[PDB]
């Protein structure tokens, strides 16, 4: 009586420690290549920012009016999103983005800044709503008559909650020094900030820069995080975009950047700009910058794991 093993006509070549191209009976794939060209968001609270920028949700341009107090498990950034309506830029913008991606949403709260002796309803043609408007969460602080002067003012706000608050103020860089004297008066202007961990200086710099939204001046946005039972102070005297409401982190979430469609039919925890990687394999060769609970990215496009024996045909 004889005894032997089985074989097949068409095997599957794999690689071993000894040889490279051993024909075995059966094999499987370990490096995922298939991609779902959608954002699988089944069972998750998804907020597609769209034309609204992630940082704008703190300042509140028109395009972010519907994102001032959002709550999400999965936050999506779009390429058409913009953080500003009036031309400007954030300082340490990427750090604040990485803070807001895992925030789980934001919760605004009025800071209660009352002003006596100045005007507080500045606007511009860029930030447009019914007419000429401004940031929803900010107040453009100006002087009382056209020209005049700005009194040395000092405000303060104490965080009366258990979570750190997000404080964002602005510095207006005018188109020219004469226009800065037109809005806030002549003389040097200083917008002093203060807290237990932060505080700084922040002098404006009026100068005719370029054109982006169609204007020339700018507004630089700065931010800090107030600890519980800590106080912030603003000793300013001109060129100040005062904050009206502070932000508080809701919980935990994840932020991604993509350009594909949202799909609540499929479920996935690994995302990239091209879609969702739904796989149980330990490796993937799709995108090295994938975020979430992803298989480890490798350079090889295929690595066949042997599931059968050595294939020796007649």
């Amino acid at each position: 009586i004889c005894l032997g093993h089985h074989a097949v006509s068409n095997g599957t070549k794999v690689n071993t420690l000894t040889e490279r191209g051993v024909e075995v009976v059966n094999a499987t794939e370990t490096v995922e290549r298939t991609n779902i060209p959608r954002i699988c968001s089944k069972g998750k609270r998804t907020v597609d920012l769209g034309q609204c920028g992630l940082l704008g949700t703190i300042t509140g341009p028109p395009q972010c009016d519907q994102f001032l107090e959002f709550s999400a498990d999965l936050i999506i950034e779009r390429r058409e999103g913009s953080d500003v309506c009036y031309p400007g830029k954030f300082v340490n913008e990427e750090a604040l983005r990485q803070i807001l991606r895992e925030s789980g949403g934001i919760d605004k709260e009025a800071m209660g800044f009352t002003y006596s002796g100045i005007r507080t309803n500045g606007a511009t043609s860029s930030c447009r709503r019914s007419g000429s408007s401004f940031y929803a969460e900010m107040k453009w602080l100006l002087s009382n008559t056209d020209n005049a002067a700005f009194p040395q003012m000092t405000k303060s706000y104490k965080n009366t909650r258990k979570s750190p608050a997000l404080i964002v103020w602005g510095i207006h860089h005018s188109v020219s020094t004469a226009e800065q004297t037109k809005l806030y008066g002549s003389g040097n202007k200083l917008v002093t900030v203060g807290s237990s961990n932060y505080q700084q200086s922040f002098v404006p710099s009026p100068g005719a820069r370029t054109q982006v939204n169609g204007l020339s001046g700018r507004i630089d946005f700065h931010w800090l995080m107030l600890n519980p039972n800590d106080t912030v102070t603003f000793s300013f005297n001109g060129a100040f975009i005062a904050p009206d409401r502070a932000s508080f982190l809701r919980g935990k979430s994840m932020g991604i950047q993509s350009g594909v469609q949202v799909d609540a039919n499929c479920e996935g925890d690994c995302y990239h700009s091209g879609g969702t990687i739904i796989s149980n394999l330990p490796f993937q060769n799709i995108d090295s910058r994938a975020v979430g609970k992803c298989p480890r990215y490798v350079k090889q496009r295929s690595l066949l794991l042997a599931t059968g024996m050595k294939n020796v045909p007649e």
Binding site: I1, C2, L3, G4, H5, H6, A7, V8, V14, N15, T16, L17, T18, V22, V24, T30, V31, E77, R79, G81, E93, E94, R97, Q98, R101, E102, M254, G255, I256, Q257, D269, S273, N280, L281, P282, F283, S288, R289, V291, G292, K293, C294, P295, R296, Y297, V298, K299, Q300, L303, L304, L305, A306, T307, G308, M309, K310, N311, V312, P313, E314
Partner: protein, 163 residues
């Protein structure tokens, strides 16, 4: 898969099996214990390698608004290093697991053959290519007694000893 010169493509019943030719016809019936053992071992390998790490990684770069060039080159440098590490680990992992899988199947085959040999004390003798030359004509029911490990090791002894 050593001195067994080739495999039985017609054995679509399992991995290992017996094929006898005595006097009551032909026989080809697969073995269940060794095949099931190898299948459970490979299945364990797959169930162990297939794994979803609960470690979540957040965004560190930015695709729409590129970060500073220096910190960006540091991030890209680190990500490329980690990518090299995981590519190496994947290559060596797959290669080693394939080697141990092939050697595992060959080992199970050798265990089957050694068991069937030890079941036949002196009733049959070896030939050369994974077969057992019988010196007493063993009918089909006796072959089935060899398959299910019930063939007696003495009740056919002296009949095949003098041969």
């Amino acid at each position: 898969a050593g001195f067994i010169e080739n495999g039985w493509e017609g054995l679509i019943d399992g991995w290992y099996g017996f094929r006898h030719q005595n006097a009551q016809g032909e026989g080809t019936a697969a073995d269940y214990k060794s095949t099931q053992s190898a299948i459970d071992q490979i299945t364990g390998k797959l169930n162990r390698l297939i794994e979803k790490t609960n470690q979540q990684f957040e965004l560190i770069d930015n695709e729409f608004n590129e970060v500073e060039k220096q910190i960006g080159n540091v991030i890209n440098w680190t990500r490329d290093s980690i990518t090299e590490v995981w590519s190496y680990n994947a290559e060596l992992l797959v290669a080693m697991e394939n080697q141990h899988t092939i050697d595992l199947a060959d080992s199970e085959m050798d265990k089957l053959y050694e068991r069937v040999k030890r079941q036949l004390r002196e009733n049959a003798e070896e030939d050369g290519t994974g077969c057992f030359e019988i010196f007493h004509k063993c009918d089909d029911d006796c072959m089935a007694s060899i398959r299910n490990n019930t063939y007696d090791h003495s009740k056919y002894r002296e009949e095949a000893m003098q041969n």
